[PDB]
Amino acid sequence: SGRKVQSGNINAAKTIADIIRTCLGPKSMMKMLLDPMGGIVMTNDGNAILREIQVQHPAAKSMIEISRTQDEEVGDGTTSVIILAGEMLSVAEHFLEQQMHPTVVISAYRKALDDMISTLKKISIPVDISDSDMMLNIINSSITTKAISRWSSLACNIALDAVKMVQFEENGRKEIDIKKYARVEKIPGGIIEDSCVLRGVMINKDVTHPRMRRYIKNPRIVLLDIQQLCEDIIQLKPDVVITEKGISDLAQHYLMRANITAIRRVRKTDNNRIARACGARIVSRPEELREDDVGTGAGLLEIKKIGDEYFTFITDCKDPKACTILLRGASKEILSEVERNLQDAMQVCRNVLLDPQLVPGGGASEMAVAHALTEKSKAMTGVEQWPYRAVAQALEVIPRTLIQNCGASTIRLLTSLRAKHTQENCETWGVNGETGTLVDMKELGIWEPLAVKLQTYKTAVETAVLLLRIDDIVSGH
Amino acid sequence: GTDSSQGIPQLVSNISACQVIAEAVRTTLGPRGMDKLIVDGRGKATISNDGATILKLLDVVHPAAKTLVDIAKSQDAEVGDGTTSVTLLAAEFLKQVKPYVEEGLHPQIIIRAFRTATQLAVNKIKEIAVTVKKADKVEQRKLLEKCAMTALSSKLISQQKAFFAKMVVDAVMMLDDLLQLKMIGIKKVQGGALEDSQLVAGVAFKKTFSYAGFEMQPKKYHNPKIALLNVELELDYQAIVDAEWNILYDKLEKIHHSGAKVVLSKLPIGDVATQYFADRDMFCAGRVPEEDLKRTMMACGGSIQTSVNALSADVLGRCQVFEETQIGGERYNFFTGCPKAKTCTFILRGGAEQFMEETERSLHDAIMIVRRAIKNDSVVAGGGAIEMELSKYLRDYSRTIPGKQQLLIGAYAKALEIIPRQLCDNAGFDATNILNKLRARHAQGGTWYGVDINNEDIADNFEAFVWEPAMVRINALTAASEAACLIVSVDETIKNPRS
Amino acid sequence: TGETIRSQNVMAAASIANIVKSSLGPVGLDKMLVDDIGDVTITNDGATILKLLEVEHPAAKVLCELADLQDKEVGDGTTSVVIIAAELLKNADELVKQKIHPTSVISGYRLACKEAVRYINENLIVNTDELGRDCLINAAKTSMSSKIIGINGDFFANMVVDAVLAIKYTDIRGQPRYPVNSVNILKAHGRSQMESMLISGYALNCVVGSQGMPKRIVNAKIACLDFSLQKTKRESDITKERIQKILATGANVILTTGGIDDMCLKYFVEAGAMAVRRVLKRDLKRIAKASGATILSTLANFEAAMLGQAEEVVQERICDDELILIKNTKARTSASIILRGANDFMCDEMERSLHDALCVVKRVLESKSVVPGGGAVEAALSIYLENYATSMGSREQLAIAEFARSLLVIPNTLAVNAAQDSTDLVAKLRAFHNEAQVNPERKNLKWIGLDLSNGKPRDNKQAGVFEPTIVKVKSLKFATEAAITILRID
Amino acid sequence: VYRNIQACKELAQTTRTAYGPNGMNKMVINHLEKLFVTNDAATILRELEVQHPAAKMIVMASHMQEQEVGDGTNFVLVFAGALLELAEELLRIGLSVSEVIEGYEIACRKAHEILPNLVCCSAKNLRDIDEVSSLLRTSIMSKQYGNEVFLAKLIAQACVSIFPDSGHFNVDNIRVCKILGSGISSSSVLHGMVFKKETEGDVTSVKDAKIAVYSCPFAEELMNFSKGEENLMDAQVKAIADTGANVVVTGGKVADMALHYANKYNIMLVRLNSKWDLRRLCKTVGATALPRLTPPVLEEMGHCDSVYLSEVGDTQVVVFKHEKEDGAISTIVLRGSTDNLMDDIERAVDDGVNTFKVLTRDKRLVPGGGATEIELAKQITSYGETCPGLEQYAIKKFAEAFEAIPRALAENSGVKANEVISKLYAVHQEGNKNVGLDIEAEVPAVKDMLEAGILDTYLGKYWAIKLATNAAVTVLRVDQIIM
Ligand SMILES: Nc1ncnc2c1ncn2[C@@H]1O[C@H](COP(=O)(O)OP(=O)(O)O)[C@@H](O)[C@H]1O
């Protein structure tokens, strides 16, 4: 009860953390799971472990759930938040055994959080905007030690065009990037070099009887979800009007009387990307049917039989925000991983659009925030001093686990690393993930972007204060 | 099955151990307290209402109970009565400080709060102390007879207790050399009315077979004294009778030569040989109690003897007179008339037998009350009025002090309130009404409203002359606080057995 | 084993308050509320914790509806009416075990609550008057403590008390009302929160209707609509003839919530009107009720006088934003602090601290009779009912003190939740409210309560930490109502 | 290994509560059924069945600490338990069991030289009674109740200040004649060996006396046996009374014809000697132990100077004084109601006078009560980051163990330990050395210890931080015994 079930909360949170502790970094040990049926599955990906695993404890469920919110925003690193919350939660109980309140602990944790968001911006190294060499270095840091290393030579371009075609100039200069409008099309057949980029949206569907006035040199897309309304359209005369249902060839000729091209059985990820690339709109109410009906969209419609398939390309569009990226090959196992790591890289170059900062990872950023927060802990007094210092050294498992799963010892390596980091303040050295040696991570080149690691540290602190905010689970067990 | 040896279980076990030994003496508080019966185990039935007479004859197995029963032993060595009050008060201190300990408050803090509250209470008792000495207590002594009247007031005994009050003020005043219970005995006489009692100036003892020899002794004698002998007097086969005959001869001649009027011994004299030891030519006595041994030597002065013709200087030395009279029909021993007279024995002439218990409950503290009202004059009221005034003062002192001691001094306050609450429960009234109606006019009208033991309504014990000694109450609550903080300071009890 | 079903009910009712004990106060913790269907619940307030709890014991179920009877009066106090009543049950069971009858304890509680509200009604405050304004200033400062507004929050506090009192509605019975959504948040990019200012109307950051209206178009008659004035092919070609039919009736400031008029700026020099896209209904309805206008979707039909009053619509630049200055209207539903900053996202918690100040200032405005906050009423009542109890002398004498010992659980809880030791703060409040009674000269020493953010003794009348008196009075009524029922149940 | 340091942790925990001036007293109902409500750690350690062998090293180090300053035992136990408690954290981090040893050794060597750099020593001499009465206040202030020390420091000092002479001192001469009865205020001072006697025939102003020595205490044919026993005890008391004795001693009770003989030759019939004064009276007057009444001679005899009767403490007692030192023996008379507080008062007296003995040879006085400990805890943890390597861990785990000592002073006084440790560590940064932990305030408030006068011996801390570290090192270097 109370602090006893709070310790139960942090125990249930820590056990799922040490389940997935070792499997970060480029030398990750493989966690195997069996069902009670005979399925024997081995993996490295932490999220794949988190998916199947059951937990009987709601605190661990919520800890999983906020990382589940984390996966679909900036991408990977979801093992790092579940790891880094757990050590803060375990070190908080040493003060909970000191009979101090959770309130002073969480305020000290927030005071560490505002320090950790600042000190990372101190050590932020500016990458230049859209220069292709350090854009390749972005690919070298974010996309390697995976199964892309024989096909990242295309992925370096697929990153750079896709980030320049998902921009959004809402409050300023093109600042919001997105991963749901980039028109991916992952069709097998052909060589992987047929995976190409273009401006516009492809559509697998077409009219079933294409004896139509189909492709017009400036398709102005109106959406619809009746030949009297087809008669009523011809006030402003758009050249295309989009439906989702079947159009007979007599109805195709009757729409040719209107000179509009409708379409059938179209997906919704297809449809919203069609409207996004072109600025479509939808109205059929007659007193709302006005000058404000027709969405002046594309600059090319194109019936194209790409891969013997009834394709319609809405290309040379209005808005360069939903644009074509084809994905070809033989099987469908690596260009999916290209899509995943390059949507993570799409958020990376979104940061490069906003805060183009590449901070040395491999624990070097972690050692920097650790040292910069220990030196700030020396001045502060009060009861919140020891928890504030605790997350100064609770968070340094990012080298410590990484030096763990590479063969080398952790004690002498970490002690010599902090020995060359405290008085060697301007160095920012990290443990290399291959030989287990302390290298200059700026010389090694492995730089994690600033905003993604800021997000991970922030979400870890939110996980800690969320768990310590919980008092009791009294509505059942 | 319950294991309790960790620190909070240590103190919880200690205070349960003091609660059970407090319940062992709970009902005996007050003058009309409930009797407790214990045995020795072999058939020696002891009915008691005293506290230390119970507590010494009681068993005690627990560590904390043993380290409070030493304070209980220390309190009887002062005056006797009052050992139940200090133990009950310290146990109520512990039971009131109980819920604050397991909620997470430190024992040194509550000990310091107990000490500061005790210093405040021992301050406030001194200002309300009232002397009553020169309001006609030794000259025109009748008001000191009036508190002598407080033993058995407004009863059927009260008419005879007028005589008992006059004689208890005489039993104090004629002998005041810091008098004790030893110097004044009471002697039960069957038959007659209770008004026919007396207070003799000397010893008084019934004579039995092994006690004393024969009547018609030198009663009206100028200097009758005592031989205190430790040899018997009673009565080869041809060489063993003549030696005994010769020993009979010389033990007969010892009475003529030494001139002892009454020989005293712890050895049997034959009353089946009554004239045969009147053929010792004088009186003798045997099988002596120790009160007779003192009060005829420390007061009369009869010398002690050793041999066959043991003469001394105080077998007919200076005492006033001898007496041997049918007091209630039965002739008693009297080596009365003591030149060092701390000896005046009460002679309970009366009809019923169990009135000896009535007088040894009611006049055995009346000697204490009267000799204390002579001994102390700075006195206060009783009946739980004094604890109620200190509880009101400390209830004010709690809320007028910032800090964690405020909850403790109030815990020091309410823990006093079981002192009259146990009293009326030993009387028979409802404690709740007799405490609430007490505290209302105690917090509005005045201080010395107290609990009456007779009609069970709130009265004014200061005007009923119920005097409690201020120094006795000071030592009482001081010892209560000390025995409180000793058990509270105790956590660990290391055992280290044999095996 | 088991005995005295009253004690069973006492434990069952006590468990409910033991759930909601640490949730009292704004610094309270979170109670995980999980049924075994898998869903979790993260919440800090005792109302929905009491509501969504799968409650078990029937005697405890007497509590959750009676505290729900607290919900339909003022809302909050639902936690404290549980906690106080459970402490009343706890002390009443100890009184029961002293052979005091539950009837006597119940009658003592019923005397104690009436004596308590009679004590309260002689010590409340109405000092927050029309000229009493600095009390409202530092009362607003309580809502924004330990935030970075605090050095500009005095300049914010002046303009926000000038926001709430000038926007105040005299109601049907004459008592002042504050509609909370009347003054509203409105960002401005550029310079920081040092220069953000209250405007006496709303000033929308959407498309500019006209410079053709003068700098003070004196009788702004709001001809607001919902259509888009776009031409089709007394109008079907809906741009002019409807708005010209109403425009001959003195339609001064036309509003088109949808699209603009096509001949807009030429009609906007003979009418002095606007055509502003995406006028949100938070401001459209609250400029309609600010002026007394009529929004016309269709307009072909009267329509002369029901285009309500505004006094001027200014056309100037306000922090890199030409705004739609719907201002100086008929009714005061138009005001907005132009939140100068970068967005509503850089000053997001800042505009949160500006909005919550309004609804914590509005509480003393409704039902102007007020008592201090910080649990000082309970400490003063524990001082009160003690000496009230010692005057009785009946069997209820021990009841009222157990009343007075129960009421101080509210400073006892808040001292725990504010990460302090619970003994010394309540003891300091008792000591300070002693000389509020035993010392006649320091009657201005009543108002010392606990600061809810730190847990320390502090003035509240000087600081504005207040509570409407009907909340305290009705919570002390309903706590006794919860006590008497479960004490009667056996 | 972990079971050994766990046994050391519980050995530290059973004495941590009895630490400082607010130590919670423990109850001893021992093997032979005593009853002690006591506070001294050496009393509890000599009673506890220490069964685990690893804790016996800690007990022996505390005993060696007792053997040379008399105090600081619970400090050794608490500091050693803290060192081992942080040593298990160092081991579970991943440090070796070797590295903690030389880390503790380096930091202890650093502490041994930083410790003489914080001293506020004694003023001029162990004379000037009222000055050194304040210096002896802290020792009994830790042991007995503080409000009692104001008389008790004077009573314990005015007797021990009799012979601070010629650079040499003995603590055995300060004795206690434990006389029951009246209160602690009725305690007084005596100059010479004192115990109660029975009879009255004492020659008082004797010369260099001739003291009896006892190692073992006490028809007509019947009358002839009586005269034979009569002249028998006559010749016995003459066998002492020949060679001219002035007193006749016995450990037991009187005899009537023997006391008449001792009045006939005018000899003092000394009675009721303890089972401990049989050596001590022989030591002070130059006496050699004699079993019976027949075998003394002039060579078999003790030599006091003045034997008479004193009535201080409201009771008749003997006096033996004016030996070769002429003021060698100086007992104290301790008056109490019961005995269960008097053993604690007695064990406070000698633990005050051994601090007087170490003040004869070490005049250095350090500020005690958290002042020295937090200072060392800051100095060594500032030294810890200077030297790199693995020892940078262990040195920083050394000084933190020093913070366990005022914490035990904190939590024995109802004070939140983290708040007062943080406040003391903050105020020690600027408001330097002489500040420490206040006892009386329920609020965690610091107070300067120099003006409070609460100072300790420097040599006691110097030996204690050596012996506790040696105990921790010699415990950490074992693995097991088959047990
Ligand atoms: N009144 C006091 N104020 C502050 N510190 C005190 C006080 N009394 C004792 N101490 C501290 O308690 C510490 C431990 O003494 P202690 O171990 O009890 O002595 P001993 O070893 O003789 O039992 C001493 O170093 C002293 O500084």
Author numbering:
A (entry chain g): 17 to 241, 274 to 525
B (entry chain H): 12 to 246, 262 to 525
C (entry chain a): 13 to 245, 266 to 333, 340 to 528
D (entry chain Q): 29 to 246, 262 to 526
Published text:
CCT is the most complex of all chaperonins with each of the two rings composed of eight paralogous subunits (referred to here as CCT 1–8). Each of the subunits of CCT and the other chaperonins can be divided into three domains: the equatorial domain, which hosts the ATP-binding site and most of the intra- and inter-ring interactions; the apical domain, which is believed to be responsible for substrate recognition and binding; and the intermediate domain, which acts as a linker between the other two domains. ATP binding and hydrolysis in the CCT subunits induce conformational changes in the CCT structure that drive protein folding. Our findings suggest that CCT contributes to mTORC assembly and signaling by folding the mLST8 and Raptor β-propellers.
We were successful at isolating human mLST8 bound to endogenous CCT from HEK-293T cells overexpressing mLST8 using a tandem affinity chromatography strategy without adding exogenous nucleotide. We solved the structure of the mLST8–CCT intermediate in mTORC assembly by cryo-EM to 4.0 Å. At this resolution, the structure shows an almost native mLST8 β-propeller bound to CCT in an unexpected position deep within the folding chamber between the two CCT rings, revealing a unique means by which a β-propeller substrate is recognized by CCT. The reconstruction shows human CCT in an open conformation with a prominent mass located in the center of the structure between the two CCT rings. The apical domains have a very asymmetric arrangement in which the eight subunits in each ring are arranged as a tetramer of dimers as observed previously for yeast CCT13. Collectively, these structural observations indicate that the mLST8 molecule is bound between the two chaperonin rings on the low-ATP binding side of the rings (the CCT6 hemisphere) through interactions with the disordered termini of these subunits. Based on these differences, all the nucleotide-binding sites were empty except the two CCT8 subunits, CCT6 and partially in CCT6′. Further examination of the nucleotide-binding pocket of either of the CCT8 subunits revealed electron density that is clearly attributable to ADP. D499 is unique to CCT6 and CCT8 and sits near the hydroxyl groups of the ribose ring at close hydrogen bonding distance. The mLST8 has achieved a near-native state while bound to CCT, suggesting that the complex represents a late folding intermediate that is ready to bind mTOR upon release from CCT.
